[PDB]
């Protein structure tokens, strides 16, 4: 939009502005193509119309002019998207918006999941705004051209799972039109929630009446492991992979925006960050936390646990497993049901 070759927000209005009838069938093509070439420039039409009329269906006459603007629109946008695929190497920028940051465990994010979350007590303290960005270095992987900042260390919930880290990444003007700041504001949320799953999973990883710990662990694994494979694979790898083809075929500014804008509002619903929090996300957050609670309880060696509320917390998890399969099966009445019916095959017990 506001790389404006157009006031198409206000000029085309129905009352306090005016619109010309014969241009409408092609006006969208004109505005998009005119943006496209104003923008590419930073990086006889009234005599083609005639030799075509010179060689009674006035409607069809007009409908053999329009191939000229059709062809010029196709040409300018066909040059414009290939330009951003080299001058801003745009497939690589969007890949990197997932691979070394904000999604993929990679090489990178485990060499970081091993640092801040250490247990001398912490590594020092999660609140230290410098330790985060510093330990995010050695982001060397397959390439090291990093430009992000693991900011807002807490930037201030009841759980052992705790809030913060509103991360961000440097994106320049050629790709500010695509990867908007509002897109980024949603792109954090997948990262954070994924981090939580990975850390509750991690804390039931890095451990090891005496068999009852083993049981509570196994019936904890089953859950988190299958959900987590739903996040990393069913929601994130799937949308991350189906995105990667279709960008080749969106072929204009206002096509390649719109594919991407749909894609995030799909991640937002299929991971269910949306306003149906109170039915599912409250439940998933507690059973995410109970795992952390059990991991600080069972200190992976001592055997002096001795305190019986944690067996009621095991019953809490059991009734939570109902809070899960029943409320997920209540979505068949109404809701965003079909990806949820694929989470609701959690095999129970």
């Amino acid at each position: 939009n506001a790389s404006a070759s157009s006031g198409s927000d206000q000029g085309p209005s129905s009352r306090q502005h005016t619109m010309v009838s014969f241009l409408k069938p092609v006006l969208k093509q004109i505005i998009m193509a005119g943006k496209s070439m104003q923008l590419l420039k930073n990086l006889e039409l009234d005599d083609v119309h005639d030799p075509l009329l010179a060689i009674t269906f006035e409607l069809t006459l007009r409908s053999c002019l329009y191939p000229h603007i059709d062809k010029q629109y196709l040409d300018c946008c066909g040059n414009l998207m290939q330009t951003l695929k080299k001058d801003y190497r745009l497939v690589e920028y969007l890949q990197a918006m997932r691979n070394f940051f904000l999604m993929e465990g990679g090489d990178t994010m485990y060499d970081f999941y091993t640092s801040i979350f250490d247990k001398i007590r912490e590594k020092e303290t999660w609140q230290n705004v410098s330790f985060l960005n510093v330990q995010l270095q050695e982001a060397v992987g397959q390439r090291y051209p990093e430009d992000s900042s693991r900011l807002s260390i807490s930037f201030e919930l009841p759980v052992h799972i705790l809030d913060g880290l509103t991360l961000s990444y440097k994106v320049p003007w050629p790709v500010d039109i695509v990867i908007s700041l509002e897109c980024q504001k949603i792109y954090n949320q997948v990262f954070l929630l994924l981090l939580q799953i990975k850390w509750a999973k991690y804390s039931l990883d890095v451990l090891l009446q005496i068999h009852r710990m083993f049981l509570l662990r196994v019936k904890l694994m089953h859950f988190v492991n299958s959900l987590h494979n739903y996040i990393m694979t069913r929601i994130l790898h799937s949308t991350g992979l189906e995105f990667q083809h279709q960008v080749e075929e969106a072929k204009d500014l206002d096509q390649l925006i719109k594919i991407h804008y749909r894609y995030l509002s799909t991640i937002h619903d299929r991971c269910l960050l949306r306003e149906k929090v109170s039915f599912v996300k409250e439940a998933i957050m507690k059973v995410l936390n109970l795992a952390l609670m059990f991991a600080d309880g069972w200190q992976a060696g001592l055997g002096t646990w001795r305190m019986e509320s944690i067996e009621k917390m095991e019953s809490d998890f059991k009734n939570c497993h109902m809070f899960l399969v029943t409320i997920l099966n209540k979505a068949v009445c109404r809701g965003s049901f079909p990806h949820l019916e694929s989470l609701a095959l959690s095999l129970m017990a």
Binding site: E104, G106, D107, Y110, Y113, M232
Partner: peptide, 11 residues
């Protein structure tokens, strides 16, 4: 290799 999970041997 890189991957979402199981890049970590106890993991």
């Amino acid at each position: 290799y890189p991957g979402y999970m199981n890049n970590d041997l106890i993991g």
